[PDB]
């Protein structure tokens, strides 16, 4: 009965990231899509993928997304957001987060 989405508060473009998605109390399997759209306009699909979540895996998942900064048209002059989304059987979740252009060290 409880579906959770935890992602990093701030997501690094052109750098892999991992987000936590859980089902609390629901021993019946599932197959969900992970979607990320530019905020606020939802103009383009930045990242899409699909994962199965079964009882074996504790009923949770660690999908790895990866926004390409090649798809962020903004400059570093103001804080541009992107929005996370999960959808499937008896579930949907939606979370807006901030984006870092960080490359490296």
XYZ file of N, CA, C and O in Angstrom:
420
model
N 0.820 -1.204 0.000
C 0.000 0.000 0.000
C 0.857 1.258 0.000
O 0.350 2.356 -0.253
N 2.155 1.116 0.271
C 2.995 2.318 0.229
C 4.058 2.347 -0.860
O 5.023 1.602 -0.810
N 3.909 3.251 -1.818
C 4.908 3.360 -2.870
C 5.832 4.563 -2.675
O 5.353 5.697 -2.548
N 7.151 4.310 -2.645
C 8.135 5.379 -2.369
C 9.090 5.651 -3.517
O 9.561 4.718 -4.189
N 9.387 6.934 -3.720
C 10.424 7.345 -4.662
C 11.434 8.255 -3.995
O 11.088 9.360 -3.589
N 12.676 7.794 -3.891
C 13.738 8.626 -3.353
C 14.805 8.832 -4.405
O 15.390 7.876 -4.904
N 15.077 10.083 -4.735
C 16.151 10.371 -5.655
C 17.057 11.378 -4.993
O 16.685 11.996 -4.002
N 18.265 11.541 -5.534
C 19.200 12.525 -4.995
C 18.567 13.892 -5.116
O 17.874 14.130 -6.103
N 18.789 14.770 -4.143
C 18.183 16.096 -4.180
C 18.604 16.851 -5.439
O 17.830 17.631 -6.004
N 19.830 16.591 -5.883
C 20.418 17.290 -7.021
C 21.070 16.305 -8.005
O 21.949 15.530 -7.620
N 20.653 16.346 -9.273
C 21.123 15.360 -10.251
C 22.209 15.881 -11.216
O 22.044 16.910 -11.868
N 23.317 15.154 -11.308
C 24.417 15.574 -12.164
C 24.250 15.157 -13.627
O 24.325 13.983 -13.983
N 24.038 16.149 -14.475
C 23.923 15.914 -15.902
C 25.162 15.197 -16.438
O 26.220 15.215 -15.805
N 25.012 14.578 -17.610
C 26.053 13.750 -18.244
C 26.830 12.880 -17.264
O 27.972 12.479 -17.525
N 26.186 12.591 -16.138
C 26.762 11.737 -15.123
C 25.690 10.829 -14.541
O 24.638 11.280 -14.105
N 25.993 9.538 -14.545
C 25.076 8.493 -14.132
C 24.536 8.799 -12.752
O 25.225 9.420 -11.949
N 23.305 8.364 -12.482
C 22.705 8.506 -11.152
C 21.814 7.311 -10.848
O 21.369 6.610 -11.753
N 21.563 7.060 -9.572
C 20.776 5.896 -9.213
C 19.653 6.358 -8.321
O 19.914 7.081 -7.360
N 18.411 5.961 -8.639
C 17.246 6.315 -7.798
C 16.523 5.110 -7.211
O 16.356 4.086 -7.875
N 16.054 5.265 -5.973
C 15.420 4.182 -5.199
C 13.897 4.182 -5.343
O 13.247 5.191 -5.035
N 13.326 3.059 -5.797
C 11.851 2.971 -5.864
C 11.281 1.725 -5.180
O 11.672 0.600 -5.491
N 10.362 1.929 -4.242
C 9.954 0.833 -3.377
C 8.462 0.588 -3.293
O 7.659 1.538 -3.354
N 8.115 -0.688 -3.105
C 6.765 -1.105 -2.738
C 6.725 -1.757 -1.350
O 7.299 -2.822 -1.126
N 6.029 -1.089 -0.436
C 5.775 -1.555 0.918
C 4.387 -2.162 1.055
O 3.357 -1.459 0.891
N 4.386 -3.453 1.396
C 3.199 -4.285 1.440
C 2.608 -4.468 0.056
O 1.698 -3.745 -0.307
N 3.130 -5.402 -0.733
C 2.539 -5.711 -2.034
C 3.302 -6.808 -2.738
O 4.011 -6.561 -3.714
N 3.135 -8.025 -2.244
C 3.931 -9.153 -2.710
C 3.622 -9.581 -4.143
O 4.134 -10.597 -4.620
N 2.792 -8.810 -4.831
C 2.519 -9.082 -6.232
C 3.417 -8.238 -7.147
O 3.419 -7.014 -7.061
N 4.192 -8.910 -8.020
C 5.146 -8.397 -9.020
C 4.675 -7.165 -9.805
O 3.501 -6.814 -9.721
N 5.589 -6.515 -10.534
C 5.256 -5.314 -11.314
C 6.250 -4.984 -12.437
O 7.344 -5.549 -12.516
N 5.861 -4.055 -13.304
C 6.730 -3.614 -14.394
C 6.518 -2.136 -14.693
O 5.515 -1.747 -15.293
N 7.483 -1.318 -14.291
C 7.292 0.126 -14.298
C 8.280 0.896 -15.168
O 9.447 0.507 -15.338
N 7.773 1.992 -15.717
C 8.546 2.896 -16.536
C 9.082 4.075 -15.720
O 8.403 4.602 -14.820
N 10.312 4.467 -16.044
C 10.962 5.616 -15.436
C 11.195 6.691 -16.504
O 11.843 6.439 -17.540
N 10.666 7.880 -16.211
C 10.539 8.993 -17.139
C 11.086 10.268 -16.542
O 10.825 10.575 -15.386
N 11.827 11.025 -17.341
C 12.334 12.310 -16.892
C 12.068 13.362 -17.923
O 12.438 13.191 -19.069
N 11.458 14.469 -17.522
C 11.117 15.508 -18.492
C 11.626 16.864 -18.051
O 11.651 17.165 -16.873
N 12.031 17.695 -18.996
C 12.509 19.014 -18.623
C 11.439 19.720 -17.798
O 10.250 19.577 -18.074
N 11.845 20.460 -16.772
C 10.873 21.248 -16.027
C 10.926 22.712 -16.442
O 12.010 23.254 -16.684
N 9.746 23.354 -16.532
C 8.452 22.721 -16.260
C 7.780 22.126 -17.499
O 6.805 21.381 -17.381
N 8.307 22.452 -18.670
C 7.586 22.268 -19.923
C 7.297 20.835 -20.403
O 6.490 20.650 -21.319
N 7.942 19.832 -19.810
C 7.792 18.432 -20.251
C 7.857 18.287 -21.786
O 7.162 17.454 -22.376
N 8.686 19.113 -22.421
C 8.801 19.140 -23.881
C 9.391 17.857 -24.469
O 8.873 17.319 -25.453
N 10.470 17.369 -23.861
C 11.196 16.215 -24.382
C 11.471 15.160 -23.314
O 11.649 15.479 -22.142
N 11.508 13.900 -23.729
C 11.850 12.807 -22.827
C 13.381 12.691 -22.692
O 14.068 12.193 -23.593
N 13.904 13.175 -21.566
C 15.341 13.157 -21.273
C 15.857 11.755 -21.045
O 16.919 11.380 -21.553
N 15.109 10.992 -20.261
C 15.438 9.602 -20.044
C 14.195 8.795 -19.801
O 13.306 9.203 -19.049
N 14.165 7.634 -20.440
C 13.091 6.672 -20.295
C 13.744 5.306 -20.150
O 14.695 4.985 -20.882
N 13.271 4.520 -19.185
C 13.646 3.101 -19.151
C 12.574 2.250 -18.466
O 11.551 2.775 -18.052
N 12.780 0.939 -18.387
C 11.756 0.060 -17.841
C 12.333 -1.026 -16.955
O 13.236 -1.751 -17.368
N 11.792 -1.155 -15.745
C 12.265 -2.202 -14.844
C 11.151 -3.025 -14.231
O 10.102 -2.496 -13.875
N 11.398 -4.323 -14.103
C 10.490 -5.220 -13.405
C 10.850 -5.241 -11.918
O 12.029 -5.256 -11.559
N 9.833 -5.225 -11.058
C 10.029 -5.293 -9.605
C 9.247 -6.455 -9.007
O 8.012 -6.417 -8.934
N 9.961 -7.486 -8.580
C 9.306 -8.660 -8.047
C 9.603 -8.831 -6.563
O 10.470 -8.149 -6.015
N 8.878 -9.741 -5.907
C 9.054 -10.025 -4.480
C 10.463 -10.485 -4.114
O 10.925 -10.181 -3.019
N 11.136 -11.196 -5.010
C 12.493 -11.649 -4.727
C 13.378 -10.488 -4.296
O 14.012 -10.539 -3.240
N 13.399 -9.442 -5.120
C 14.163 -8.244 -4.840
C 13.513 -7.357 -3.798
O 13.329 -6.171 -4.057
N 13.157 -7.932 -2.644
C 12.664 -7.181 -1.497
C 11.509 -6.247 -1.810
O 11.024 -5.539 -0.926
N 11.067 -6.255 -3.066
C 10.067 -5.313 -3.567
C 10.586 -3.891 -3.618
O 9.919 -2.959 -3.170
N 11.794 -3.742 -4.151
C 12.357 -2.428 -4.414
C 13.354 -2.497 -5.557
O 13.730 -3.582 -6.013
N 13.776 -1.328 -6.015
C 14.668 -1.263 -7.152
C 15.591 -0.055 -7.132
O 15.245 1.020 -6.583
N 16.757 -0.270 -7.752
C 17.832 0.706 -7.875
C 18.128 1.005 -9.349
O 19.224 0.719 -9.835
N 17.146 1.571 -10.078
C 17.408 1.936 -11.471
C 18.430 3.054 -11.591
O 18.455 4.008 -10.790
N 19.276 2.929 -12.603
C 20.259 3.944 -12.908
C 19.812 4.740 -14.128
O 19.705 4.208 -15.237
N 19.522 6.014 -13.902
C 19.261 6.962 -14.978
C 20.508 7.751 -15.369
O 21.549 7.677 -14.688
N 20.386 8.532 -16.446
C 21.493 9.346 -16.936
C 21.023 10.441 -17.890
O 20.885 10.212 -19.092
N 20.767 11.627 -17.343
C 20.419 12.798 -18.140
C 21.628 13.261 -18.913
O 22.690 13.446 -18.330
N 21.478 13.470 -20.227
C 22.573 14.063 -21.005
C 22.476 15.590 -21.007
O 21.442 16.131 -21.388
N 23.530 16.277 -20.583
C 23.520 17.736 -20.592
C 23.461 18.230 -22.030
O 23.272 19.420 -22.292
N 23.645 17.298 -22.959
C 23.578 17.605 -24.376
C 22.147 18.006 -24.730
O 21.904 18.577 -25.796
N 21.216 17.717 -23.812
C 19.772 17.978 -23.984
C 19.211 19.137 -23.120
O 18.025 19.474 -23.208
N 20.067 19.725 -22.282
C 19.730 20.917 -21.499
C 20.161 22.181 -22.256
O 21.362 22.459 -22.380
N 19.192 22.945 -22.758
C 19.488 24.138 -23.561
C 19.859 25.375 -22.734
O 20.288 26.394 -23.283
N 19.697 25.280 -21.417
C 19.927 26.415 -20.520
C 21.413 26.731 -20.313
O 22.282 25.894 -20.571
N 21.693 27.955 -19.868
C 23.028 28.334 -19.410
C 23.042 28.300 -17.877
O 21.981 28.284 -17.241
N 24.241 28.304 -17.294
C 24.426 28.237 -15.839
C 23.939 29.477 -15.070
O 24.144 29.575 -13.856
N 23.290 30.403 -15.775
C 22.860 31.687 -15.205
C 21.620 31.574 -14.308
O 21.350 32.472 -13.505
N 20.874 30.476 -14.440
C 19.708 30.234 -13.578
C 19.345 28.747 -13.422
O 19.524 27.949 -14.350
N 18.811 28.402 -12.247
C 18.576 27.012 -11.832
C 17.486 26.246 -12.564
O 16.318 26.328 -12.201
N 17.883 25.458 -13.555
C 16.928 24.728 -14.372
C 16.628 23.342 -13.782
O 17.533 22.613 -13.368
N 15.344 22.994 -13.737
C 14.897 21.755 -13.104
C 14.593 20.648 -14.090
O 14.283 20.896 -15.258
N 14.633 19.418 -13.596
C 14.086 18.309 -14.374
C 13.172 17.471 -13.474
O 13.330 17.474 -12.254
N 12.223 16.753 -14.064
C 11.203 16.035 -13.294
C 11.134 14.531 -13.537
O 11.060 14.045 -14.677
N 11.145 13.819 -12.420
C 11.164 12.375 -12.388
C 9.749 11.856 -12.279
O 8.862 12.517 -11.728
N 9.566 10.637 -12.773
C 8.249 10.065 -12.937
C 8.386 8.559 -13.002
O 9.257 8.035 -13.683
N 7.529 7.855 -12.286
C 7.503 6.410 -12.365
C 6.064 5.973 -12.590
O 5.155 6.477 -11.922
N 5.844 5.043 -13.521
C 4.470 4.591 -13.800
C 4.286 3.084 -14.067
O 5.074 2.453 -14.770
N 3.221 2.520 -13.501
C 2.902 1.117 -13.707
C 1.688 0.659 -12.918
O 0.912 1.478 -12.409
N 1.533 -0.666 -12.787
C 0.414 -1.312 -12.096
C 0.152 -0.706 -10.729
O 0.995 -0.802 -9.840
N -1.014 -0.091 -10.565
C -1.408 0.468 -9.280
C -0.437 1.526 -8.750
O -0.504 1.866 -7.564
N 0.468 2.039 -9.595
C 1.401 3.077 -9.107
C 1.845 4.184 -10.077
O 2.047 3.956 -11.271
N 2.005 5.385 -9.531
C 2.701 6.466 -10.221
C 3.308 7.408 -9.194
O 2.745 7.611 -8.120
N 4.475 7.954 -9.516
C 5.183 8.845 -8.599
C 5.831 9.953 -9.387
O 6.237 9.767 -10.530
N 5.949 11.111 -8.768
C 6.413 12.257 -9.504
C 7.211 13.160 -8.608
O 6.729 13.578 -7.560
N 8.436 13.471 -9.018
C 9.291 14.307 -8.181
C 10.188 15.282 -8.942
O 11.028 14.878 -9.727
N 10.029 16.569 -8.667
C 10.839 17.582 -9.322
C 12.177 17.749 -8.616
O 12.224 17.861 -7.394
N 13.267 17.781 -9.372
C 14.567 18.026 -8.769
C 15.413 19.001 -9.549
O 15.169 19.284 -10.743
N 16.431 19.491 -8.848
C 17.382 20.445 -9.390
C 18.541 19.757 -10.125
O 18.925 18.618 -9.809
N 19.104 20.466 -11.097
C 20.106 19.887 -11.966
C 21.475 20.557 -11.842
O 21.580 21.778 -11.918
N 22.525 19.760 -11.658
C 23.888 20.275 -11.739
C 24.557 19.985 -13.067
O 24.522 18.859 -13.564
N 25.198 21.010 -13.615
C 25.964 20.861 -14.839
C 27.322 20.240 -14.542
O 28.082 19.952 -15.459
N 27.632 20.031 -13.268
C 28.916 19.438 -12.906
C 29.392 18.354 -13.867
O 28.669 17.415 -14.212
N 30.639 18.492 -14.287
C 31.284 17.441 -15.045
C 32.218 16.667 -14.121
O 31.945 15.506 -13.789
N 33.299 17.311 -13.671
C 34.332 16.569 -12.943
C 35.375 17.411 -12.217
O 35.227 18.626 -12.054
N 36.439 16.712 -11.817
C 37.499 17.230 -10.966
C 38.890 17.077 -11.577
O 39.362 15.944 -11.865
